[PDB]
Curated annotation (Swiss-Prot):
Gene3D superfamilies tied to this protein: FAD/NAD(P)-binding domain
Annotated pathway: Cofactor biosynthesis; NAD(+) biosynthesis; quinolinate from L-kynurenine: step 1/3; Siderophore biosynthesis; quinolobactin biosynthesis
Enzyme Commission identifier(s): 1.14.13.9
GO biological process: anthranilate metabolic process; kynurenine metabolic process; L-tryptophan catabolic process; NAD biosynthetic process; NAD metabolic process; quinolinate biosynthetic process
Protein species of origin: Pseudomonas fluorescens
EC supergroup of this enzyme: oxidoreductase
Record gene name: kmo
Protein name (record): Kynurenine 3-monooxygenase
Domain of life: Bacteria
Molecular function (Gene Ontology), one example: NAD(P)H oxidase H2O2-forming activity
Residues annotated to bind FAD: 10-11, 30-32, 49, 99, 123, 299, 312-313
Its biological purpose: Catalyzes the hydroxylation of L-kynurenine (L-Kyn) to form 3-hydroxy-L-kynurenine (L-3OHKyn). Probably required for the synthesis of quinolinic acid and the siderophore quinolobactin.
Length: 445
């Protein structure tokens, strides 16, 4: 009945609330300070896309209305490319939520449910044999604490995950990507001056690099630049973080490549030199738990590239699943095994689907095969909105488990490919629709 959670982020704080109100004694430890303590100057955090499946996880926790109150409705996407004014491409919605706003709400929810939360305390080591762990603060205190069940919700660099290696082989494989990212900020004045639409997701596509911006209720926007770390050996002058040696270089790059975005980025030079360049990676594990003693949740279990906007959504789903299993199972070891069996297939799937979105960020001309496929898929979905559901729509706008969206997507892509092989005018749409009904079962099977 006792549980210790490391990491008061999105997954850890949600699972604290779900367990605490299910009668667990919950202690939650966080390395950062309490964002609920009002200071004189609020810091900036990123805005995240919350999709239907994440919103539904919050509804099960009884916190959806709270979060929605501070979330910006995004009705569609606005693509910005030179030579056209952007116009809204309508989506059904995606909510833009501020990370720290969400976190404060989750924290209040966890505490209201009876969890004890401890801030400014980082997990440094775990001794599984002696079931003790040690927390450290900046005051030099080294706090040794006893634990029964340990939930690692401590993010993509999990200290819990690292500790688990000492006692079990996690079968880790880290796959890195050549793009990094940089977080930047459009202020409310700038967005208003350039009439940036608050109720939309904004994209600046540019072949091998790109910017995406999500809104905040105060009309500021957080912008993410995705760009190669280094210029390719054979394409040595192409843009990369390696060339952008300082803020002035960054400014010249934005001026040249993102002319209409550069004016909105007032602290670009500042932001570029301070904010570290983030890495893109996928980490996969064969095992998420050590018997009944510890389990990994969210980014701690399954780091993924941020290209389908689903990491937080997955983490919130994870929390719901972990608390469901901990209640309905015989013992903790069985719960953790069952949890891993449910969610690890979903995690691998979204990790893969995220990478597939990522690889499209290319200046390579799209193969006419892939183009005809997508165009044919659109037609089929129109004719049988029943069965043929585009995979992105299954992921982003439904609650269908990721593994099942990936499976239906495979059946669908395969059908499209055999149909398109060897322009669309020669393709018999009746023959294709016949194959769609023969090969793709309705959702009710
Ligand atoms: C550029 C970018 C854009 C993204 N956009 C989206 C998006 O639009 N939508 C979406 O769904 N996802 C998005 N994601 C993914 C999303 O941020 C993560 O998947 C999600 O935050 C993971 O939730 P979590 O609780 O598992 O981890 P976290 O939210 O990272 O929580 C981990 C917590 O543990 C704490 N902690 C860490 N180490 C320790 C320690 N040793 N001791 C104690 N506490 C510790 C941290 O302070 C933190 O509070 C994005 C990610 C990136 C990088
Ligand atoms: C306009 O139609 C589309 C609808 C949906 C998608 S999607 O579902 O497949 N990908 C998605 N990425 C995000 C997302 C949000 C925040 C940050 C990031 N990020 O890359 O950091 C990604 C939201 S939806 C794509 C579409 O066209 C490309
Ligand atoms: C990995 O490759 C695929 C995987 C899955 C599928 S699918 O058949 O299951 N989903 C489909 N999406 C579209 C579609 C159309 C218009 C815009 C978008 N959009 O991402 O914005 C998608 C057409 S078909 C297709 C694939 O390539 C054709």
């Amino acid at each position: 009945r006792q549980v210790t959670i490391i990491g008061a982020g999105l997954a850890g704080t949600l699972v604290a609330r779900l367990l605490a109100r299910n009668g667990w004694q919950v202690n939650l430890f966080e390395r950062r300070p309490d964002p609920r303590i009002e200071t004189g100057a609020r810091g900036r955090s990123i805005n995240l896309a919350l999709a239907e499946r994440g919103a539904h996880a919050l509804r099960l926790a009884g916190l959806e209305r709270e979060v929605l109150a501070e979330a910006v409705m995004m009705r569609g996407r606005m693509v910005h490319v030179p030579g056209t004014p952007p116009n809204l491409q309508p989506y059904e919605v995606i909510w833009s939520i501020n990370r720290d706003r969400l976190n404060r709400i989750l924290l209040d929810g966890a505490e209201a449910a009876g969890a004890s939360i401890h801030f400014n305390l980082g997990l440094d080591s775990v001794d599984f044999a002696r079931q003790r762990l040690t927390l450290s603060n900046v005051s030099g205190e080294r706090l040794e604490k006893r634990f029964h069940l340990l939930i690692g919700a401590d993010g993509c660099n999990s200290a819990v995950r690292q500790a688990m290696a000492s006692v079990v082989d996690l079968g880790e494989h880290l796959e890195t990507q050549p793009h990094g990212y940089k977080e930047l900020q459009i202020t409310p004045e700038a967005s208003a001056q350039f009439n940036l639409e608050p109720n939309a997701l904004h994209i600046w596509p540019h072949g091998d690099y790109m910017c995406i911006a999500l809104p905040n209720l105060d009309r500021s926007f957080t912008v993410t630049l995705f760009l190669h770390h280094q210029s390719p050996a054979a394409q040595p002058a192409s843009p990369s973080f390696a060339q952008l040696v300082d803020g002035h270089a960054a400014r010249r790059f934005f001026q040249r490549q993102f002319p209409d975005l550069s004016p909105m980025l007032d602290s670009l030079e500042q932001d570029f030199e301070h904010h570290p360049t983030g890495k893109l990676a996928t980490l996969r594990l064969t095992t998420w738990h050590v018997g009944g003693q510890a389990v990994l949740l969210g980014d701690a279990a399954h780091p993924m590239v941020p290209f389908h906007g689903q990491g937080m959504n997955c983490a919130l789903e994870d929390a719901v699943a972990l608390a469901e299993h901990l209640q309905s199972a015989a013992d903790n070891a069985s719960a953790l095994a069952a949890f891993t069996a449910q969610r690890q297939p979903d995690a691998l799937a979204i990790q893969a689907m995220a990478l597939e979105n990522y690889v499209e960020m290319s200046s390579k001309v799209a193969s006419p095969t892939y183009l005809l496929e997508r165009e044919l898929g659109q037609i089929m979905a129109q004719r049988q909105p029943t069965r043929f559901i585009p995979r992105y729509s299954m992921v982003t706008f439904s609650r269908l488990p990721y593994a099942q969206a990936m499976a239906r997507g495979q059946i669908q892509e395969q059908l499209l490919k055999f149909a398109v092989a060897n322009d669309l005018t020669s393709i018999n749409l009746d023959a294709v629709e016949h194959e769609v009904t023969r090969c793709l079962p309705p959702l009710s099977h």
